[PDB]
Design a protein around this ligand. Structure first.
Ligand code: HEM
Ligand code: HEM
Ligand code: HEM
Ligand code: HEM
Ligand code: HEM
Ligand code: HEM
Ligand SMILES: [Ca+2]
Ligand SMILES: [Ca+2]
Ligand SMILES: [Ca+2]
Ligand SMILES: [Ca+2]
Ligand SMILES: [Ca+2]
Ligand SMILES: [Ca+2]
Lengths: 156, 157, 156, 156, 157, 156
C-alpha cells in the first residue's frame, strides 16, 4: 500500500515493545554489525543456489557494507521515529532483489540467519535481565520480519 | 529440488538445538494450537489486503483446522525424524498459496505472528529455565522460518 | 431421482412457452451476463450474513465467471434441447452449496435478484412487443425457478 | 434474526415499486384467491412426490383456505404497512413445513406456480396499462419470493 | 358419561375371561404391533374413501406409532386394572376422529381388520392349546369392540 | 358408495374363507337364532341407555322376529350368493336406526354381543375340528362386522 500506511504498521509493530527493547536490540546490533554481515554472507556463499547471485569479491567490496547499513537502518527506525524513511529504503532494497530475481525464499532464510545470530548475541549480554532479554529477542524477530515483509512487497 | 535434499536443510537447522528444545517447543505448540490458529486468522482478517483472500466460512470450516495440523507437522518433524515427509508437505502447502497468488509477504507476516505468539507462551512457561526458554525460542524462530522457506519455493517460478 | 426424470419437468415447464420467449430471454441474458453477475455478487457481498460465505477473491477469480456460465447454461437448455445435461449440472451445483451449508434462503434470494434484473432488462427492450416482453418475463421466472428447484434437491 | 430486521428487507423490497403496483397486485390476487389455491393444490396433488405429504381431506378443509389467507397476507403487507407482523407470520409458516420435512424445493416450486398464475392473470387485465402490468409482474415475483425466503429461514 | 362409569363396562367385559386370556392376547399384540399397524394402514390406504383422510407422511410419522400405543393401551387395561385411564384415552381418541368427521363405519372396518389379524396370529401360536386360543380370540373381539365403542361415544352428538 | 360396490366388498370379505366356514356359521346360527335374539335383547334391555329406545313389549312382538330374520340374511348371503340383496337390506336397517337416532355405539355393542355368543356356540360344536372352528369364528366376526359397517353407512 502507501508508504504512509506502511510506516504506521512498522510503528504499530514496534509499539508492542518498550523503548528499552529497541535500545538493547540497537546496541547489540551496532556493536556486532560487521560480524553479523560476516555470518550472513558466509551462510549465503556456502549455498550454491545462493552463491549463484553472489561472489566473494562482491561481498567484501559492496554487500558487506550495504548489509551493515541495512542493519543500522532497521534498528534505528523506532528509536529515531524515522518510520517513513526506513520503509522507503526497504522498498528500494526489495526492488533491487526482485529486479535481478533473487529467490524470495533465500531472502526469508537470510532474515532468519540474522534473527538467530542477533538473538544468540542478546542471550550472552549479561547486562540484560532474563525478561528484558526475552522481550528484546521477540522484538528482534518482529522488526526484522517487518523489514523483510516490506522488502517482499516487490515480489507481488 | 528433491525433498530428500530439502530434508537435509531442515535437519541441519534443527540439529543446532538439543531435542529438549524440540520437545519444549512441540508441547507449547500442541497445547495452544487452537489458540494459535485463532491468533493467526484474527490478524489476517484485520488487514483488508489479506481479508480479500478470506471468508469467515473458509476460516471456520477449513483453515482453522488446517493451521493446527500445519503447526503439528512443523513441530513433530525433528522429534519424529520425519524430515522428508514434512518438506513434501510444506512444498505442497506453498504450492496451494502460489497457485491462488497469495502475496508472499502476507505469508511472511503470518509466520511472524506465529513466532511472536509461541515465544510469548514460551516466556510464561515457568517450568522452563531462563536459558531453556531462550534456546527454545530461537529454535521456534528457526524451524518456523525454515518451514515458511519451503512453502515459498512455490513462488520462485 | 434420475436426471432423465427431472429433464421431463424442465421440458414441460419450457414447453408452456414458444421458442420466441426462449430466444428473447437467452438474447438479453447473453448480452448482459457480466452485469447480471455484477449485480448478483454486489447484493450478496453487501449483506454481512451472505458475505460470511464469500471472499472477494473467490468472487473475482471464480464465481463471477461461474455465474455467467450458469446463466448461459440455463437459457440455452430449451433452445439447444439439452434438458438432461442441464438438470445434471443444476443438481451438482446445488450439491456444492449444501455441502458448505449455504443457507437455502440466500439461494432463493439470489434467484429472485436474477429474475428481477433480467425482467427489468427485458422491459427496456425496444425491439420486443408488449405481449412478447410479458410472456418472456413469465418464462424467465419459470425457467430460473426451475433451475433453483433442481439446485434445491440437494438440500432435502 | 429479529422480525424487526426482516421487515426492513420486506419494506425495502416493496419500496422498489410504487403503491400502484402493490394495489394492482393485491386486487388481482383477492379477486382470484380461491382459483389460485385451486391451481396450487392441483399441481401439488398430481405429483406423487408432493402428494406424499398431502391428504385430500387436509387440502379441502384446511389448506385450501390457509393458502387464500397466506396470499391475502402477503399482498396486504406493503399497502397496510404491516411489515413486522407479516414477516413473523411467514417465519411461523416456514417452521410448520420444516418441522414435518416438506422438501424445500417443493416450496420453491409452489411459489413459482403462484407467481406464474398471478402474472398470467395480470396479463389479462384490460384495466391496466402495458408498463403498469409489467412493473406489477416484477413486483409480484419480488414480494412472493421475499415471502418464500422468510419461510425458508426455517430450513437453515 | 363418567369414565368411572364406563370403566365398569370395560371391567365387566374383561371379567368374562380369565387373566390367562388377557395375558395371551397382550403378548401376541405387543409382539406384532408394528406388523398390526402395517396391516391396518395398508387396508385403509387401499380403500379410496379412507385414503381421502390419509397421507403417506401422516401415517409414517404419526399414525403408525399411534396405532401401536393404542393397541398397547387396549391390551394393558385389564392386566394393569387401569380401566379408568384406558376409557379416558379411548374417549379422547374417538373425539379426534369425530371432530374431523371420519365416518364411523371406517372405524368399524379398522376394528374388524385388527380383530381378524390378531386372531390369525393367535391361531398359529402353537404354545396355546386349542381351547385357550379360542377363548383368547373371543376376548380379543370383545375387548377391541369395547374400545371402539368408547371411541364412538364421540359420534352421538 | 354404490350397492354394487358394497356387494363386491361383502363377497371379497367372505371369499377369504372357504364355503365350509360359511356353512358352519350358517348352521349354528339357524339352530340357535331365537336364543341369539334372546341374548341380544336381554343385553340391551338391561342397559338403561339402550332400554330408552326399547321395551319388553316391542321385543316380544317385533324386534325378536326382525333380529332372527336379520341373522338368517347375514349368514345366507355368501352361501346363496345373494350379496346385492343383503347389502340393500343392511342399508334399510341402518336407515331405520339413524332415523330414530339409535346411538351408533350401541349398534357396535350389539354386533359384539352376537359375535361373542355365536363364537361361544361354535366352540361347543364338537362336530367341528379345532382349525375349522377357529376359521369359522374369524368369519363370524368378519361377516357380522361387515354387515354392521353397511348398517353404519346411514350415520355418516
Ligand atoms: C534479509 C535479507 C537481505 C538483506 C537485508 C539484503 C540487503 C541488501 C542491500 C541493503 C542491498 C543494496 C541495495 C541498494 O544499494 O540499493 C542489497 C543488494 C544485493 N543483494 Fe541483498 N539482501 C538480502 C538478501 C539477499 C539474498 C538472499 C541474496 C542472494 C544472492 C542477495 C543478493 C544481493 C545482491 C547481488 C545485491 C547487489 C545488487 C546489485 O549490485 O545490483 N541479497 N542487498
Ligand atoms: C505461514 C503462513 C501460512 C500458513 C502456515 C498457512 C497454512 C495453510 C494450510 C495448511 C492450508 C491448507 C493446504 C491444503 O489445502 O492442502 C492453507 C490453505 C489456504 N490458505 Fe493458508 N497459510 C498461511 C498463509 C496464508 C495467508 C496469509 C492467506 C491469505 C491472506 C492464506 C490463505 C489460504 C487459503 C485461501 C487457503 C485455501 C485455498 C483453497 O481452499 O482453495 N494462507 N494454508
Ligand atoms: C441463484 C443462486 C446461485 C447460483 C445460480 C450460484 C451459482 C454457483 C455455481 C455455478 C457455482 C459452481 C462453482 C464451481 O463449481 O466451479 C457456485 C459455487 C459457490 N457459490 Fe454459488 N450460486 C448461488 C447462490 C450462492 C449464494 C447465495 C452463496 C453465498 C452467499 C454462494 C456461494 C458459493 C460458494 C462458496 C461456492 C463454492 C466455490 C468454491 O469453493 O469452489 N452461492 N455457485
Ligand atoms: C409457496 C409455498 C407454500 C405456501 C405459501 C404454503 C402455505 C401454508 C400455510 C399458510 C400453512 C399453515 C396452515 C396452518 O398453520 O393452519 C401450511 C401448512 C401445511 N402445508 Fe403448506 N405451503 C406451501 C408449500 C407446501 C408444500 C409444497 C406442501 C407439500 C407438498 C405443503 C404442505 C403443508 C402441510 C402438510 C401443512 C400442515 C397442515 C397441518 O397439519 O396443520 N405446503 N402451508
Ligand atoms: C379402530 C380404528 C382406529 C383406531 C384405533 C385409530 C387410532 C388413532 C389414534 C390413537 C390416533 C391419535 C390420537 C391423538 O392424536 O390423540 C388417531 C388419529 C388419527 N386417525 Fe385414527 N384410528 C382408527 C381409525 C381411523 C380411520 C378409519 C381413519 C381414516 C380413514 C383415521 C384417521 C386418523 C387421522 C387423520 C388422525 C390424526 C388427526 C390429526 O392428526 O389431526 N383413523 N387414530
Ligand atoms: C347389530 C345390531 C342391530 C341389529 C342387527 C338390529 C336389527 C334390526 C332390524 C332388522 C330392525 C327392523 C328394520 C325394518 O323392519 O326395516 C330393527 C329395528 C329397530 N331397532 Fe335395531 N338392530 C340393532 C341394534 C339396535 C340397537 C342397539 C337398538 C337400541 C335400542 C335398536 C333398536 C331398534 C328399534 C326400536 C327398532 C324398531 C324401529 C321401528 O319400529 O320404527 N337396534 N333393528
Ligand atoms: Ca542472559
Ligand atoms: Ca521463563
Ligand atoms: Ca417495453
Ligand atoms: Ca395486458
Ligand atoms: Ca392353535
Ligand atoms: Ca371345539
Amino acid at each position: 500500500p502507501s508508504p504512509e500506511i506502511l510506516a504506521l504498521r512498522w510503528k504499530d509493530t514496534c509499539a508492542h515493545y518498550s523503548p528499552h527493547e529497541w535500545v538493547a536490540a540497537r546496541n547489540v546490533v551496532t556493536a556486532n554489525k560487521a560480524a553479523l554481515a560476516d555470518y550472513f554472507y558466509e551462510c549465503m556463499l556456502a549455498d550454491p543456489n545462493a552463491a549463484f547471485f553472489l561472489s566473494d569479491q562482491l561481498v567484501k567490496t559492496k554487500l558487506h557494507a550495504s548489509m551493515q547499513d541495512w542493519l543500522e537502518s532497521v534498528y534505528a527506525a523506532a528509536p529515531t521515529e524515522e518510520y517513513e524513511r526506513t520503509v522507503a529504503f526497504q522498498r528500494k532494497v526489495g526492488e533491487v532483489h526482485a529486479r535481478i530475481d533473487i529467490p524470495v525464499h533465500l531472502v526469508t532464510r537470510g532474515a532468519c540467519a540474522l534473527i538467530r545470530r542477533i538473538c544468540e548475541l542478546l542471550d550472552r549480554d549479561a547486562s540484560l535481565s532474563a525478561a528484558q532479554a526475552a522481550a528484546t529477542c521477540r522484538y528482534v524477530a518482529d522488526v526484522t520480519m517487518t523489514a523483510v515483509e516490506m522488502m517482499c512487497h516487490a515480489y507481488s
